Amino acid sequence: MTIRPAYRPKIVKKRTKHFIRHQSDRYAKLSHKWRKPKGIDNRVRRRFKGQYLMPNIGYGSNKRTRHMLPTGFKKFLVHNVRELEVLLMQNRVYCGEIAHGVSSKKRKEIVERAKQLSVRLTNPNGRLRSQE
Amino acid sequence: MADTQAKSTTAPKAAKAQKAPKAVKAPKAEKPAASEAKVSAKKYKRHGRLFAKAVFTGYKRGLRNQHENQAILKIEGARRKEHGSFYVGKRCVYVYKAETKKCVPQHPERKTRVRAVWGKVTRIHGNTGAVRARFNRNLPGHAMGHRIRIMLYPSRI
């Protein structure tokens, strides 16, 4: 529908599956997210052979497909119609995500104006659902 | 003495022929005066029509690694490394069955019960004819003893 942005390549990432925090299997007081286990015995700290691939600066993406969402842009926070005037002339580059304290009164005012401003949103149809 | 062996086996380029670079025969003929041209016989087994059968034998396995981005094959026709080098550069394709269809027949007709990942063999590996092979994705892991294929594409003489 919308023209895809501004020299859209193959977004091809190094390691994709998430990174899950040594011994978070047998403690559900242990969360999901990582903490380099800094203590002198460990079985992953020594970057061993078998465990949950240990992060560093290697795995990142290219320094032009930084932040690049699967539709070419780089995502960007939007609040009201005045910040969509920030996306006046850059409309072929970035996109918008309607901030989730905006009600369905004001989100009527983005989706009918910035459509004609030719920007892309990730989420229209939030509370649309054609009721109040 | 070996100078005619720089000459006489260009008679294959004179019996094919192309520019005819030898007059001495090397014919493998039934004549008593024709006892040459030196075949490296024997083998007499086809495995070459189309989808010439070759079952599959795990990945390019280290002892204690995997390197599962590649895979290794067992090519039932071949039994010495002069055989298998005719399987350079062919594709490698393997079918395996599954439940639903989920796709219309448009590029040439498919009611879609068969499902098959794909690939491409490269190089001769084992000193008897085992010839490793790479795929499109990765060889789905439970196939070590499934009847995968090699089709003739592409080929030459």
């Binding site: - | 087994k45 086809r46 029509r49 005719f86 089709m151 030459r156 003489i157």
Partner: protein, 228 residues
């Protein structure tokens, strides 16, 4: 004039042209035509060849990169000559034993069934698809009907509807085969021409009553080390 000396095609390092142009020049009296056309000139009397501002503007659009737009390269193929009956592996017509006719400058190679015997048309196939065979089916003195060509048999064309553009479309439309009536006659010109030469040969594996069945081979016979 003359003495072009282009030995740039078998060595491949040979140039051999600077060795001529020393005394080959006349060394004086340079006279040449020297076209100096100022014709790209905005004489906008009632003309307006600026060009006129349909745009002249900043409609922002970004398009793929300026590629090499390469040359139709010369065609390295294994040494085989029409006519040679070959085993078709493709085209939803595998197993038919069909014969070479003519190589084409697109890197392509003309094959027929023929449709009289094999019931197969004048199909053009890749050399990589088809396995070449051993010996010759003699087609030396043929009429070589090269007026049928590649661009003569392209798809014609992407109109999207009825040569008029923005119109209505229907499901399962036909624009690529009736099949064409002339190709039936173009089949008839060669099928009568090929039957007399294919039945006069001494009979073999794929010659007279012999080609028309579907490649399938008994053991002790090679894909491997056959002088094939």
């Amino acid at each position: 004039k003359g003495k072009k000396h282009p030995v740039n095609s078998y060595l491949k390092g040979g140039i051999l042209r600077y060795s001529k142009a020393q005394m080959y020049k006349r060394r004086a009296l340079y006279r040449l035509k020297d076209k100096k056309s100022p014709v790209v000139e905005k004489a906008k009397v009632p003309i307006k060849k600026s060009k006129a501002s349909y745009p002249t503007k900043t409609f922002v659009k970004k398009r793929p990169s300026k590629a090499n737009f390469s040359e139709h390269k010369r065609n390295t193929r294994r040494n085989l000559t029409p006519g040679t009956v070959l085993i078709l592996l493709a085209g939803r017509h595998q197993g038919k034993r069909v014969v070479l006719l003519k190589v084409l400058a697109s890197g392509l190679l003309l094959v027929t069934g023929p449709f009289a015997l094999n019931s197969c048309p004048l199909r053009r196939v890749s050399q990589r698809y088809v396995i070449g065979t051993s010996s010759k089916v003699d087609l030396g003195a043929f009429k070589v009907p090269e007026h049928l060509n590649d661009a003569y048999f392209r798809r014609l064309k992407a109109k999207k509807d009825k040569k008029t553009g923005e119109a209505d479309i229907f499901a399962a439309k036909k624009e690529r085969f009736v099949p064409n009536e002339q190709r039936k006659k173009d089949q008839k010109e060669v099928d009568a021409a090929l039957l007399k030469v294919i039945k006069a040969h001494p009979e073999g594996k794929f010659f007279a009553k012999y080609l028309q069945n579907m490649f399938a081979l008994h053991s002790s016979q090679y894909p491997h080390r056959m002088r094939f």
